[PDB]
Amino acid sequence: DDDIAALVVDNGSGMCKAGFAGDDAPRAVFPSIVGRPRHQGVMVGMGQKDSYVGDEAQSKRGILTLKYPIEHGIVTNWDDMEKIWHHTFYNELRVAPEEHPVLLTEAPLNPKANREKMTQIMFETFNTPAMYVAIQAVLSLYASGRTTGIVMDSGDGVTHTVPIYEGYALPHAILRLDLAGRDLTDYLMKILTERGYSFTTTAEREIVRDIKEKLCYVALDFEQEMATAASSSSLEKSYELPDGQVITIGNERFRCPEALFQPSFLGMESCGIHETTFNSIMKCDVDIRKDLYANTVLSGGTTMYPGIADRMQKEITALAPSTMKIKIIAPPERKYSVWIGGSILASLSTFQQMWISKQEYDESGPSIVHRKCF
Amino acid sequence: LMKILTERGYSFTTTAEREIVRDIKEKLCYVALDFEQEMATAASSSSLEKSYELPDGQVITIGNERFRCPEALFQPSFLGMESCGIHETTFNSIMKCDVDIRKDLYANTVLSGGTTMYPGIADRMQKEITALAPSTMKIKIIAPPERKYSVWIGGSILASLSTFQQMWISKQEYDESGPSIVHRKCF
Amino acid sequence: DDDIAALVVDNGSGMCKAGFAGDDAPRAVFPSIVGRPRHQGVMVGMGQKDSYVGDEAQSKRGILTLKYPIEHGIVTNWDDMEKIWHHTFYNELRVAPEEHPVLLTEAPLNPKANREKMTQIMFETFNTPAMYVAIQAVLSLYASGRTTGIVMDSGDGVTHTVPIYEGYALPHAILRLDLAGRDLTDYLMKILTERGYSFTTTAEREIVRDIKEKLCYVALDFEQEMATAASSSSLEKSYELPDGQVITIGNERFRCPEALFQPSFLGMESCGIHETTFNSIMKCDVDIRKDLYANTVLSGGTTMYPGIADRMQKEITALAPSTMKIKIIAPPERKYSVWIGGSILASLSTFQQMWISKQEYDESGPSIVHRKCF
Amino acid sequence: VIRVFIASSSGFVAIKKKQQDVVRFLEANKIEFEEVDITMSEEQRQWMYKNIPPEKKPAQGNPLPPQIFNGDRYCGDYDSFFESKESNTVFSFLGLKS
Amino acid sequence: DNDNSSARLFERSRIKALADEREVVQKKTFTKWVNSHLARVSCRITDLYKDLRDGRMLIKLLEVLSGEMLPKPTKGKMRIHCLENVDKALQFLKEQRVHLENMGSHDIVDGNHRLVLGLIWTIILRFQIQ
Amino acid sequence: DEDEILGALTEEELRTLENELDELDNALLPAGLRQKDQTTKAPTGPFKREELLDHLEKQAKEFKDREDLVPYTGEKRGKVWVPKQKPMDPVLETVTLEPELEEALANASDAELCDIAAILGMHTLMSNQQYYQALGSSSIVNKEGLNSVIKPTQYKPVPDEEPNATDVEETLERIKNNDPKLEEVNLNNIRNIPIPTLKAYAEALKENSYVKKFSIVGTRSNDPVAFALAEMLKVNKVLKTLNVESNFISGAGILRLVEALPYNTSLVELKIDNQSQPLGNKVEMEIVSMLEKNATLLKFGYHFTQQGPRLRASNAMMNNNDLVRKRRLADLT
Amino acid sequence: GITTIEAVKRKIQVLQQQADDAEERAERLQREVEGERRAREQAEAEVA
Amino acid sequence: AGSSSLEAVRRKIRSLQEQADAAEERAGTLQRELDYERKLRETAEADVA
Ligand SMILES: Nc1ncnc2c1ncn2[C@@H]1O[C@H](COP(=O)(O)OP(=O)(O)O)[C@@H](O)[C@H]1O
Ligand SMILES: Nc1ncnc2c1ncn2[C@@H]1O[C@H](COP(=O)(O)OP(=O)(O)O)[C@@H](O)[C@H]1O
């Protein structure tokens, strides 16, 4: 009866979700994009109300430039955040922010100004009564229903692995790798340009992202896949464009996600995601390693590649000792599970102590988020 | 054992790892009957090595450290202590008694406690005490197989006796004479 | 044969220092880093060479991956040590090692195979007529000039405390703690993330180490310094990156060495260096402690932070009884003290009896080092 | 010959991302280029500040490392490159005909 | 190692049997007591270790024994809500002077026999029916 | 109310749920085949890009305009924080120690000022290297100043090395000809060597009895090259040193290399450092366990992640070198 | 439709029955283990 | 994520499968423990004889 509870807002790097607490599915799902008129002032200033947001922005791909206000989990532009947040509050949820608490998510090891700026925007612009900031990986572990395991979360801007044993987090073993789906999009464009299909601008960005989501897969064996793709054409598929032209992907279906495991294709001096998980496990203590082997949890929209779980299990079993067992939990709904975690965490009766109310903000300022959260 | 397992490159530092080292000691330590001969045997061949599995799946090899840790009970100079060994302590405690009661004490030596559960402790103790004692006396080491609980078991005997009902420190006596009553009743 | 002068070589975790015996300062000081080609592409600058050793590897950071042959005072890569020693003998001192004796240093509590492999490698691949292995913290006391005191050494790989009374070392009181400059560098990377700056690769590690060597200091009172730093920007200083941009560390300049006094920041449950020294003093006998309190000697490159001496004296004075008198001897040249005492040790006339001959090695194998050395 | 100026070691993620985007674009379109590091050599770093015109500089501090030159013709920074990518005028921006 | 084998032999047999028989008869008595006290409401416990895992049985038992109102148990099938339900009963016990050692909500949730038996014994001994 | 919840869902969704439960994704099918195709139309055309651009543009033009319920104006509807100000410390005292020493330090430059600043104990004010050279000697050495910014070490430039001039085809032809005056073959850091060419080298060195050292460092070699080299090592009796560092060899390929070691007694140094992916501890255990079988190899360059295999490999190398020492000693006497 | 209704009933019955039969197997196997422990310990006390 | 009721039904099916699998694994480990106990019976009885 607390003004139909709080609102869970999972503002991902490439796409935002919002909804009410206590519900299984988010009410609103739309990309986090701001579209502006590109260079012209034609047709009586066509492109009026110059900020196009969300679905309306991707509707007019040809005549606009699409800018992502979140890059690598860090807010480059704050006006675009508060425009997106205004769109979420008023244009789709259609609820007043004055009577509803807000839950927000962020990357683990982020610059400290982001929390203070989000608190300032929540309390000074939308005057929300209470607000809290959490971590996506802890929400994923909440959504999985387990209190012990290692969580990988890979969105469009950041990948991070955290271990949690018995509800106790280990801050020294938390890792952050800056290799996400945007880099895979750029690599897909690079390998598509060699075939003959050159894709440059933001409309091409949306088209290439759609191609990657609809036609990619993680090969179990890379050299065997190369031999199969060179020998025959059974792996080849066809993708039709919105106008009607049809192209063939072929060899580019499995080379795009392989940069997740071998970053040498992307031009980055880094290890793979499996090495990140293994090194995060080795940084824990001796005894609690085994449970972290038996409770590996995947999350995020990047992990919807087909066959990622079996391949990463094969890699981990190649690295791990042969005595104990390795299993990987890959729920089919994991892309939304972070938001679902919020829908659990705002639903708990004991969480009412943890809200940052306006009265304490009016005495402490935006620095109170360092003491109240985490 | 931690300090000597550092010699092989294995590292244990935290309090949680001390339990692991204690488990290794309980499973894989024994008292050598002769120390220099055992060192020569362990240096000459690798038949004395054993393998242990860590809780995280790692496999370690103890080898020469199996009998060097219990040997510290008989030579305390390994720890830097200048005290004497357990056999010397037992012989000195016998020698402090009167002349007449020594003959019964030489044949009735009893071991107790968990630390005396190393395989081969009884033979080594008997050999060393027989070396110290005169030849005409005979040494018998009594090591019951359930000795780890002997300190409990005799207690379970002692509370079942008839006259021990006259031994208890009652609540009224403590109320009358404070907490210093325990010296008057208990030995 | 007084023309035959031995060579004093200290193989530290970060830097190697080599020189001739009987000299006040080492002739060659250079980091022990092996650089190998990256996998992103072929290099520009080298042909038939497989790797770079020394300052040549340090200068070409942008095309190389850097590896340390010494990890926590342990030689993980023996071929890397052969490369380092070959570069030291042939490229820095420009002398043939066949004609000169060699003196080496070692941490106290090591794997027993370290000395054996070191002796075997030296005798077989360099044909030195005589050699010897010594322990670093005895050489520090030789350099200080007294025969009684406790030596607390902190290098780039390990920290160790040992007491000596009248030249008799107490092996049961030697303590070894795994806390050195590399963990401080990693913590500095972790605490430089929240200001915005990000450092990932090995070249970034060298940049962060260079920042730490010039910007960090030990606070006398941690809470008072924290309040002072939150009060104003008096403590802030600026650094110039090689790219051109200028960073401002601010608060965390005295947070990095605080891990030496509170290891719980790194997540380990060990004690600080002051507690370690006090425990090492308590392990000795009652009588000699009065000398050991008066002759605490600092050493190592890690103890070069300003304000360490007064802080350590304050902590030990808090721990120790009030009657006892405590002073901390911090020589201004202490960074090279481990080398300097070695130059003393090869100069003594008795030490000529202590060398390990080639013939003695020929009969006795590599196990002669245990009987001949301490 | 196109020369792109790259800082191999940098504390900012966005600089490395922009440099890798420029490298990927030159790599995909089969365009020959020179790979020049400003951190590894001081002389080219000093020359790179020296060539660029003053009317578009950063107000505070040194200019950002990703810069494009055509011989000693100066093409531009990452901003003009992204604008030409949007406007499909990239070949004119680098000065390479057709 | 015949003496060590005999020590492990005695450990495996006599201590385990003497603890097991006491545990069995104690839990059989406790089930009868909690069933007699829970019969006023429409509730019944068929297994001591499994029915007290979820937490509704315990909060209803404290409801009937105290005779006094308790907060709403959270509704949900996952583990976290179960932890909440056990924790609220533990807090209610913490208010009325009852002293507990080695008691966590995850101990009851996971199903440790010793701790649930000790909790029921403490309820019988120190708590007041009133 | 399970039945009511299922009735609340669509009946077509219920039939789809029954079909999906019968299908349970496609675990049986391989990774490539488990995806569904998008469309059934055949590929047509060489992908004229301008048609795509023009179609997207007119699609943007003829779109009905979504009108938002509430316009955005950037209105601040909450209370401003307005951070507090402190009264701070308004103290002012003049020390005035000496008319001589007033004028002595009044006109001093900042560079020479920092020396007396550091000697008195303001270590926080300047950098540590500056602070120590201030205390180094009894003279003014400090040039920079306390306010000035610190700069990194430049070290020293390294001259460029000449690129690899070793040609491929003539070297392979000389290897196949069993050339007596070709002993060292260098292939380090060469652009775009074909994999079949490297395999041809691998069978070419099978019958060559005059080349003693080989190196393919930084050639982007892969598992077939490793397999061919492992086959070659059993036949050859002359090759002393094989270098395969900085490559793309997987763990199984390295296992094939170490599995050839017991058969041949002519290799003394093998280096496999800096591979793209870690080999895993199982491969390391096999490597060390059956490298203990071999007694000829003396030098082995690999960085073991685990401690057990590393210790056993070091012991095996010690044993091999000690065997060399023992046979030399026995030959002498 | 109706076929969906018996499909839902069939899946619910199959899952519930699998859970239940696994439950009796584990539970009467636990009975079996307890009987084994009783008889083993008392015969083994005779050994002692 | 299409609707909340869909996720509720999905979680019911997932819970049923997961609980059945857990019971299966517990039954298996109890079976091998039972075999170990029976071997202890046989050895003890032979030693009694
Ligand atoms: N069906 C799919 N198959 C493969 N990849 C997908 C699919 N759907 C989304 N992705 C990938 O997931 C990314 C979106 O991740 P998202 O969940 O939006 O990240 P965030 O955590 O920032 O919200 C896209 O870049 C896309 O590459
Ligand atoms: N001027 C300095 N100030 C603070 N720390 C320093 C300074 N110079 C070096 N160090 C630290 O000391 C380390 C080198 O110590 P070193 O003397 O090489 O140890 P070792 O005993 O292993 O030789 C470096 O990693 C660096 O972190």
The 3 state secondary structure assigned to D43-63 is HHHHHHHHHCCCCCCCCCCCC
Within 10 Å of residue H13's Cβ, how many Cβ atoms? Answer: 15
Q: In degrees rounded to 5, what are phi and psi of residue D97?
A: -75, 130
Of all protein residues, whose CA lies closest to atom 15 belonging to ligand 1? A301
Q: Which residues have CB under 8 Å from F228's CB, separation 6+?
A: F198, F199, F202, F203
Residue from A114, A219, A192, A200 nearest A157 by CA:
A114
DSSP reduced 3-state for A286? coil
> CB-hemisphere CA count at 13 Å for A355?
22
Q: What are phi and psi of D3, to 5 degrees?
A: -115, 125
What DSSP designation does E130 have?
A: -
CA distances in angstroms from F112 to C335, D42, E1, H17, listed in the order given: 26, 29, 80, 79
**Which residue's alpha carbon is nearest to atom 8 within ligand 2?**
C213
Of C126, C104, C99, C89, the C-alpha closest to C1 is C99
- Asked if residue A346 lies in contact with residue A8, where contact means CB atoms within 8 angstroms, the answer is yes
Question: F160 CB contacts (<8 Å, ≥6 apart)?
Answer: C44, C45
| Candidate from B9, B13, B79 with C-beta closest to C270 | B13
Contact in structure between A130 and A355 (CB atoms under 8 Å): yes
Token pair 């045997």 is at which residue? B41
Q: Is G39 in the H-facing interface, judged by CB distances under 8 Å?
A: yes
The residue of B22, B23, B56 whose CB has the most chain A CBs within 10 angstroms, and thus the best one to mutate to test that interface, is B56
Ligand nearest to the backbone CA of C260:
2
Three-state DSSP state, F299: strand
Q: Quick count: other Cβ atoms within 10 Å of Cβ B100?
A: 7
The 8-class DSSP code of residue F149 comes to P
Rounded to a whole number of angstroms, the distance between the first and last alpha carbons of chain A is 27
Chains touching D (3+ CB pairs < 8 Å): A, C
Q: Chains B vs H: touching, with 3+ CB pairs under 8 Å?
A: no
**With contact defined as beta carbons under 8 Å apart, do A83 and F75 qualify?**
no
State the Cα–Cα distance between residues F110 and F140, nearest whole angstrom. 11
For chain G, the distance separating the N- and C-terminal CA atoms, rounded to the nearest angstrom, is 70
CATH topology of domain A181-266: Actin; Chain A, domain 4 (3.90.640)
Contact C254, C220 (CB under 8 A): no
Residue type for F141, please?
V
CB < 8 Å to E10, chain G: 48
| Residues A37, A47 contacting (CB under 8 angstroms) | yes
The alpha-carbon radius of gyration of chain C (Å, integer) is 22
**Ligand 1 neighbour A304 (Cβ under 6 A):** yes
Query: Do A354 and A132 meet the contact criterion of CB atoms below 8 Å apart?
Result: yes
Instruction: For residue C248, give the H/E element and its range.
Output: strand C246-248
Q: Which of G14, G15, G21 to mutate to test the interface with H (most CBs of H within 10 A)?
A: G15
- CB-based contact B56 A322, cutoff 8 Å: no
Min Cα separation A296/chain B (Å): 16
A73 pocket-lining for ligand 1 (C-beta < 6 Å): no
H/E segment holding residue D35: strand D33-37
Residue of D17, D28, D85 with shortest CB distance to A190:
D28
Which ranges constitute the DSSP H helices of chain A? 42-45, 55-59, 78-86, 113-124, 136-144, 181-195, 202-214, 222-231, 252-261, 273-282, 289-294, 308-319, 334-345, 358-364, 368-372
Burial of C139 (0-12, 13-18, 19+ CB in 10 A): buried
- E45 with E38: CB under 8 angstroms? yes
Do C320 and C293 meet the contact criterion of CB atoms below 8 Å apart? Answer: yes
Closest protein CA for atom 11 of ligand 1: A302
One-letter-per-residue 3-state SS of chain F: CHHHHHHHCCHHHHHHHHHHHHHCCCCCCCCCCCCCCCCCCCCECCCCHHHHHHHHHHHHHCCCCCCCCCCCCCCCCCCCCCCCCCCCCCCCCCCCCCHHHHHHHHCCCHHHHHHHHHHHCCCCCCCHHHHHHHHHCCCCCCCCCCCCCECCCCCCCCCCCCCCCCCCHHHHHHHHCCCCCCCEEECCCCCCCCHHHHHHHHHHCCCCCCCCEEECCCCCCCHHHHHHHHHHHHHCCCCCEEECCCCCCCHHHHHHHHHCCCCCCCCCEEECCCCCCCCCHHHHHHHHHHHCCCCCCCEEECCCCCCHHHHHHHHHHHHHHHHHHHHHHHHHC
Domain, as residue range, for F314:
168-332
Q: Looking up tokens 């792109």, which residue turns up?
A: D4
Q: Is the dihedral of CA E86, E89, E95, E100 positive or negative?
A: negative
Q: Which ligand is nearest to the CA of C70?
A: 2
Residue B178, token pair as written in the block: 């404070």
A14 C-beta closer than 6 A to ligand 1: yes
Q: Do chains C and E touch (3 or more CB pairs under 8 A)?
A: no
Q: By C-alpha distance, which of C349, C335, C281 is closest to C305? A: C335
> Given CA atoms D74, D77, D80, D84 in this order, what sign does their dihedral have?
positive
Question: Residue type at C305?
Answer: Y
How many whole angstroms from C185 Cα to the centroid of ligand 2? 11
Distance CA(A233)–CA(A221), nearest Å, equals: 17
Do the Cβ atoms of C22 and C34 come closer than 8 Å? no
Per the document, the length of chain G is 48
- Please classify residue F68 by burial: count the beta carbons closer than 10 Å to its beta carbon, then call 0-12 exposed, 13-18 middle and 19+ buried: middle
Residue type, position G29, single letter: L
The two most distant CA atoms of chain C are separated, in Å, by 70
Judged by DSSP in three states, G36 sits in helix
Q: What is the dihedral of CA B26, B28, B34, B39, to 10 degrees?
A: -130
Query: How far apart are the C-alpha atoms of A24 and A17, rounded to whole Å?
Result: 12
Put simply, the answer to whether H1 touches A333 (Cβ < 8 Å) is: yes
Pair of tokens at residue H32 = 């091998």
* N residues, chain B: 187
**CA C338 – CA F179 distance, rounded (Å):** 53
What b/e string do you get for A112-126 counting C-beta neighbours within 10 Å, with b at 16 or more? eebbebbbbbbbbbb
Of B104, B180, B95, the residue nearest B142 (C-alpha): B104
The CATH number for B1-79, chosen from 3.40.50.1100, 3.10.20.440, 3.40.50.720, 3.90.640.10, is 3.90.640.10
C157 DSSP 8-state letter: S
Q: Give the whole-angstrom CA distance, residue E18 versus residue E126.
A: 26
Chain E residue whose CA is closest to B115:
E4
Contacts of residue B154, defined as CB under 8 A and 6 or more positions apart, other chains included, come to: none
CA H5 to chain centre: 30
Residues 6+ apart with CB under 8 A from B160: none
Task: State residue F198 phi and psi, 5-degree precision.
Answer: -65, -40
Question: H12 — contact with chain A (CB < 8 Å)?
Answer: no
**How far apart (Å, rounded) are the C-alpha atoms in residues F218 and F191?**
9
Structure tokens at C38: 């990256």
- A109 CA to middle of ligand 1, Å? 21
Rg (CA), chain E: 17
Q: Give the number of other CB atoms < 10 A from CB of residue A163.
A: 28
Q: Which residues in chain C are immediately followed by a break of C to N over 2.5 Å? A: none
Helices (H), B45-138: 65-71, 86-95, 102-106, 121-132
Q: What is the residue with the minimal CA distance to atom 27 of ligand 1?
A: A181
Interface test with G, best of E2, E5, E13 (most G CBs within 10 A): E13
User: CA of F206: how far to CAs of A347, B170, F184, F243, in Å?
Assistant: 72, 95, 15, 16
Tell me, rounded to whole angstroms, the distance of Cα C142 from its chain centroid: 17
As a whole number of angstroms, the distance between CA B55 and CA A290 comes to 8
CB-based touch D/E (3+ pairs, under 8 A): no
What's the rounded Cα separation, in Å, for the pair F272 and F253? 11
Burial of F165 (0-12, 13-18, 19+ CB in 10 A): exposed
Shortest CA distance to C120 belongs to which of F317, G3, B143?
F317
- Across the F:H interface, residue pairs with CB atoms under 8 Å apart total 13
C371: how many CB neighbours lie within 10 A of its CB?
9
C323 CB contacts (<8 Å, ≥6 apart)?
Answer: none
The total of other beta-carbon atoms located within 10 Å of residue A145's CB is: 18
Locate the chain B residue with the closest alpha carbon to A321: B57
Residue whose structure tokens are 């050699």: C131
Please enumerate in sequence order all residues whose Cβ is within 8 A of that of G36, keeping only pairs 6 or more positions apart, or say none.
Answer: H34, H37, H38, H41
Which residues have C-beta within 8 Å of that of residue A172, sequence separation ≥ 6? Answer: A283, C266, C267
Chain C positions touching B3 (Cβ under 8 A) are 109
Do A249 and A213 contact (CB within 8 A), yes or no?
A: no
Can you read off the two tokens belonging to residue F279?
A: 């080999």
**Residue the block writes with tokens 């204690």:** B22
> Residue F287 maps to which CATH number?
3.80.10.10
Half-sphere exposure of C152 (CA within 13 A, CB side): 28
Going by their DSSP bridges, the two strands D33-37 and C356-357 should be labelled as: unpaired
Check: CB of residue A286 under 8 Å from CB of residue B56: yes
Task: Judge whether B69 and B29 are in contact, CB under 8 Å.
Answer: yes
A153 CB near ligand 1 (under 6 Å):
no
Mutation choice for A interface testing from F17, F24, F59 by most A CBs within 10 A = F59
Contacts of G42 in chain E (CB under 8 A): 17
CA distance F160 to E27: 83
Helix (H, G, I), strand (E, B) or coil at A319: helix
Note the helical H segments in B6-163.
15-28, 35-44, 65-71, 86-95, 102-106, 121-132, 150-158
Beta strands A149-154 and A296-297 are: parallel
| C-alpha angle F324-F309-B54 in degrees, rounded to nearest 5 | 145
The structure tokens 């309980």 sit at B26
What atom in ligand 2 is closest to the CA of residue C11?
23
Given a contact cutoff of 8 angstroms between Cβ atoms, the answer to whether F280 and A319 are in contact is yes
Top mutation candidate among A66, A213, A305 for ligand 1, by most atoms within 8 Å of CB: A213
- Pocket of ligand 2 from Cβ distances under 6 Å: C 12-15, 155-157, 181, 209, 212-213, 300-302, 304-305, 335; F 128-129
C-alpha Rg value of chain A to the nearest Å: 22
CB B126 within 8 A of CB B86: no
3-state secondary structure of F263: coil
Task: Name every chain G residue with its beta carbon within 8 A of the beta carbon of F15.
Answer: 1, 3-4, 7
Sign of CA dihedral E51, E53, E54, E58: positive
Provide the CA E121 distance to its chain's centre, in angstroms. Answer: 8
Distance of CA A238 to the CA centre of its chain: 28
F13 touches chain H (CB under 8 A): yes
Q: In this complex, is the C-beta atom of H21 within 8 Å of any C-beta atom belonging to chain A?
A: no
At residue D76, φ and ψ (nearest 5 deg) are: 165, -175
SS3 of residue A82 by DSSP: helix
Enumerate the residues of chain F whose CB falls inside 8 A of the CB of residue C122: none
Other beta carbons within 10 angstroms of residue F326's beta carbon come to: 12
Q: For residue C107, which ligand has an atom nearest its CA? A: 2
* Cβ neighbours of E1 in B, within 8 Å: 119
Is residue F216 within 8 Å of residue F244, measured between CB atoms?
A: yes
Assigned CATH for C181-260: 3.90.640.10
User: At what resolution in Å was this solved?
Assistant: 3.6
Q: Which amino acid is at C354?
A: M
C216 vs F contacts (CB less than 8 Å): 128
CB A264 within 8 A of CB F222: no
Whether the Cβ atoms of residue C33 and residue C57 lie closer than 8 Å to each other: yes
> CA separation (Å) from B92 to B35, B82, B96, G11?
23, 16, 6, 81
